[PDB]
Design an enzyme around this catalytic site. Structure first.
Site, PDB file in Angstrom:
ATOM      1  N   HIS A 102       0.775  -1.290  -0.063  1.00 22.47           N
ATOM      2  CA  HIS A 102       0.130  -0.028   0.150  1.00 22.47           C
ATOM      3  C   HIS A 102       0.915   1.308   0.046  1.00 22.47           C
ATOM      4  O   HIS A 102       0.201   2.341  -0.464  1.00 22.47           O
ATOM      5  CB  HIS A 102      -0.896  -0.076   1.284  1.00 22.47           C
ATOM      6  CG  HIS A 102      -1.677  -1.292   1.239  1.00 22.47           C
ATOM      7  ND1 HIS A 102      -2.653  -1.617   0.485  1.00 22.47           N
ATOM      8  CD2 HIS A 102      -1.984  -2.144   2.496  1.00 22.47           C
ATOM      9  CE1 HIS A 102      -2.999  -2.777   0.959  1.00 22.47           C
ATOM     10  NE2 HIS A 102      -2.653  -2.925   2.158  1.00 22.47           N
ATOM     11  N   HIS A 148       5.408   6.306   7.071  1.00 24.05           N
ATOM     12  CA  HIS A 148       4.967   5.676   5.720  1.00 24.05           C
ATOM     13  C   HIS A 148       4.539   6.973   4.843  1.00 24.05           C
ATOM     14  O   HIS A 148       4.393   8.291   5.226  1.00 24.05           O
ATOM     15  CB  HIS A 148       3.809   4.801   5.811  1.00 24.05           C
ATOM     16  CG  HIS A 148       2.579   5.233   6.199  1.00 24.05           C
ATOM     17  ND1 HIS A 148       2.232   5.008   7.430  1.00 24.05           N
ATOM     18  CD2 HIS A 148       1.773   6.391   5.631  1.00 24.05           C
ATOM     19  CE1 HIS A 148       1.075   5.552   7.535  1.00 24.05           C
ATOM     20  NE2 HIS A 148       0.880   6.368   6.571  1.00 24.05           N
ATOM     21  N   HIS A 187       2.172   8.912   1.085  1.00 24.43           N
ATOM     22  CA  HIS A 187       1.284   9.096   0.109  1.00 24.43           C
ATOM     23  C   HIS A 187       1.763   9.692  -1.010  1.00 24.43           C
ATOM     24  O   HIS A 187       2.349  10.879  -0.553  1.00 24.43           O
ATOM     25  CB  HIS A 187      -0.073   9.247   0.716  1.00 24.43           C
ATOM     26  CG  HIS A 187      -0.478   8.211   1.823  1.00 24.43           C
ATOM     27  ND1 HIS A 187      -1.468   7.388   1.906  1.00 24.43           N
ATOM     28  CD2 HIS A 187      -0.172   8.601   3.127  1.00 24.43           C
ATOM     29  CE1 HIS A 187      -1.631   6.933   2.897  1.00 24.43           C
ATOM     30  NE2 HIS A 187      -0.891   7.456   3.862  1.00 24.43           N
ATOM     31  N   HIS A 228       3.873  10.311   6.730  1.00 23.03           N
ATOM     32  CA  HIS A 228       2.600  10.074   8.117  1.00 23.03           C
ATOM     33  C   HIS A 228       3.745   9.485   8.996  1.00 23.03           C
ATOM     34  O   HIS A 228       4.310   8.361   8.659  1.00 23.03           O
ATOM     35  CB  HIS A 228       1.552   9.272   8.040  1.00 23.03           C
ATOM     36  CG  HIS A 228       0.413  10.161   7.233  1.00 23.03           C
ATOM     37  ND1 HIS A 228      -0.606   9.504   6.425  1.00 23.03           N
ATOM     38  CD2 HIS A 228       0.044  11.414   6.949  1.00 23.03           C
ATOM     39  CE1 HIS A 228      -1.396  10.294   5.846  1.00 23.03           C
ATOM     40  NE2 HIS A 228      -0.957  11.513   6.206  1.00 23.03           N
ATOM     41  N   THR A 283      -6.627   6.344   7.512  1.00 23.33           N
ATOM     42  CA  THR A 283      -6.915   6.674   6.062  1.00 23.33           C
ATOM     43  C   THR A 283      -6.936   5.438   5.181  1.00 23.33           C
ATOM     44  O   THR A 283      -7.067   5.438   4.274  1.00 23.33           O
ATOM     45  CB  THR A 283      -6.165   7.722   5.498  1.00 23.33           C
ATOM     46  OG1 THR A 283      -4.944   7.281   5.301  1.00 23.33           O
ATOM     47  CG2 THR A 283      -6.235   9.005   6.214  1.00 23.33           C
ATOM     48  N   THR A 284      -6.918   4.165   5.848  1.00 29.78           N
ATOM     49  CA  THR A 284      -7.114   2.860   5.223  1.00 29.78           C
ATOM     50  C   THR A 284      -8.002   2.059   5.986  1.00 29.78           C
ATOM     51  O   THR A 284      -8.157   2.065   7.318  1.00 29.78           O
ATOM     52  CB  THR A 284      -5.529   2.170   4.989  1.00 29.78           C
ATOM     53  OG1 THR A 284      -5.168   1.769   6.337  1.00 29.78           O
ATOM     54  CG2 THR A 284      -4.678   3.019   4.435  1.00 29.78           C
TER      55      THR A 284
HETATM   56  C1  LIG Z   1       1.819   1.904   4.735  1.00 27.28           C
HETATM   57  C2  LIG Z   1       0.177   1.825   5.045  1.00 27.28           C
HETATM   58  C3  LIG Z   1      -0.395   2.922   3.933  1.00 27.28           C
HETATM   59  O1  LIG Z   1       0.049   2.749   6.305  1.00 27.28           O
HETATM   60  C4  LIG Z   1      -0.131   1.701   7.281  1.00 27.28           C
HETATM   61  C5  LIG Z   1      -0.445   0.382   6.646  1.00 27.28           C
HETATM   62  C6  LIG Z   1      -2.020   0.447   6.834  1.00 27.28           C
HETATM   63  O2  LIG Z   1      -2.709   1.585   7.175  1.00 27.28           O
HETATM   64  C7  LIG Z   1      -2.227   2.477   7.819  1.00 27.28           C
HETATM   65  C8  LIG Z   1      -2.829   3.807   7.577  1.00 27.28           C
HETATM   66  O3  LIG Z   1      -2.286   4.998   8.449  1.00 27.28           O
HETATM   67  S1  LIG Z   1      -2.689   6.374   8.034  1.00 27.28           S
HETATM   68  N1  LIG Z   1      -2.722   6.787   6.738  1.00 27.28           N
HETATM   69  O4  LIG Z   1      -3.926   6.770   8.602  1.00 27.28           O
HETATM   70  O5  LIG Z   1      -1.647   7.379   8.999  1.00 27.28           O
HETATM   71  O6  LIG Z   1      -2.865   2.286   9.421  1.00 27.28           O
HETATM   72  C9  LIG Z   1      -2.055   1.743  10.460  1.00 27.28           C
HETATM   73  C10 LIG Z   1      -2.587   0.300  11.036  1.00 27.28           C
HETATM   74  C11 LIG Z   1      -1.630   2.638  11.514  1.00 27.28           C
HETATM   75  O7  LIG Z   1      -0.728   1.440   9.693  1.00 27.28           O
HETATM   76  C12 LIG Z   1      -0.772   2.232   8.419  1.00 27.28           C
HETATM   77  O8  LIG Z   1      -0.352   0.934   5.283  1.00 27.28           O
HETATM   78 ZN   LIG Z   2      -0.991   7.481   5.995  1.00 23.87          ZN
END
Ligand SMILES: CC1(C)O[C@@H]2[C@@H](CO[C@@]3(COS(N)(=O)=O)OC(C)(C)O[C@@H]23)O1
Ligand SMILES: [Zn+2]
Length: 259
Positions: A70, A97, A99, A122, A200-201
């Site tokens: 992702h 991570h 975006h 983030h 956001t996921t």
């Molecule tokens: C690399 C990526 C995109 O970010 C990780 C994982 C699953 O989603 C996240 C998203 O965090 S966020 N974008 O709300 O700061 O939520 C958690 C579970 C915190 O991990 C993040 O995939």
């Molecule tokens: Zn994120």
């Protein structure tokens, strides 16, 4: 759910069915979601939002970075933490991570006054709770990335690592670097926006205290393009990783504040 969640781009670029953002399950359809547009002049100043204190952000480490399908994600392993920032407790760093897109005018999840930035980074932290889950269990620090011609030397360990993790579930070790190498000058981080929202996921849990810093990270266009050039969403490498961005959500009855 009838298939795995994906970003819009994935469904458009492959014939393999997946669930796009407007169709996400979990808590993704509830009313305190992220990301949002921030109208900077409408955010009220709150005096209690003071400076952040960073711990372990200056120390050089050799970080593990991985492609999770992702995004790319540095594992911070509680080796850094934050306090201040109008936060109720200190928070431990878990992961960093990003975006992005491949166009300079998009790639950020949040927007400032209707402007998206080339990327958004983030840094996810977890609350040190007491006795007495909450709306602010997770603190995500969001930095906007502006594309230009300035080579950001601090990003080079991460950019070079990308070649080594093209497919999901691949992990590599970055050359020596600090978290501060990746951020604007500390003194420019005094101005930020604050609101309560979600991850956001999926499952988009409404447990995030958000911080979006006013000051952008400056990255060269070709350093930003290295992300879509080097990474893929799939082991088959049929869809380059970019537009890993959730569409904008409504603020609704919530309030955005600023330092
Ligand atoms: C690399 C990526 C995109 O970010 C990780 C994982 C699953 O989603 C996240 C998203 O965090 S966020 N974008 O709300 O700061 O939520 C958690 C579970 C915190 O991990 C993040 O995939
Ligand atoms: Zn994120």
């Amino acid at each position: 759910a009838e298939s795995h969640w994906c970003y819009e781009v994935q469904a458009e670029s492959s014939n393999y069915p997946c669930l796009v953002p407007v169709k996400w399950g979990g808590n993704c359809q509830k009313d305190r979601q992220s990301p949002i547009n921030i109208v900077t002049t409408k955010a009220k100043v709150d005096k209690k939002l003071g400076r952040f204190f960073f711990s372990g952000y200056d120390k050089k480490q050799t970080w593990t970075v991985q492609n999770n399908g992702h995004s790319v994600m540095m594992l911070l392993e509680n080796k850094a933490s934050i306090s201040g920032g109008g936060l109720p407790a200190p928070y431990q760093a878990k992961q960093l991570h990003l975006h992005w897109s491949d166009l300079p005018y998009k790639g950020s999840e949040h927007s400032l006054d209707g402007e998206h930035f080339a990327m958004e980074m983030h840094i996810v932290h977890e609350k040190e709770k007491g006795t007495s889950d909450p709306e602010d269990e997770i603190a995500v620090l969001a930095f906007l990335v502006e594309a230009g011609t300035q080579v950001n030397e601090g990003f080079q360990p991460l950019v070079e690592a990308l070649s080594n993790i093209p497919k999901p579930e691949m992990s590599t070790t970055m050359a020596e670097s600090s978290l501060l190498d990746l951020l604007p000058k500390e003194e420019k981080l005094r101005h930020y926006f604050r609101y309560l929202g979600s991850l956001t996921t999926p499952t988009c849990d409404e447990k995030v205290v958000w911080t979006v810093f006013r000051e952008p990270i400056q990255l060269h266009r070709e350093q930003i393009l290295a992300f879509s050039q080097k990474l893929y969403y799939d082991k088959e490498q049929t869809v380059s990783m970019k537009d890993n961005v959730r569409p904008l959500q409504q603020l609704g009855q919530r309030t955005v504040i600023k330092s």
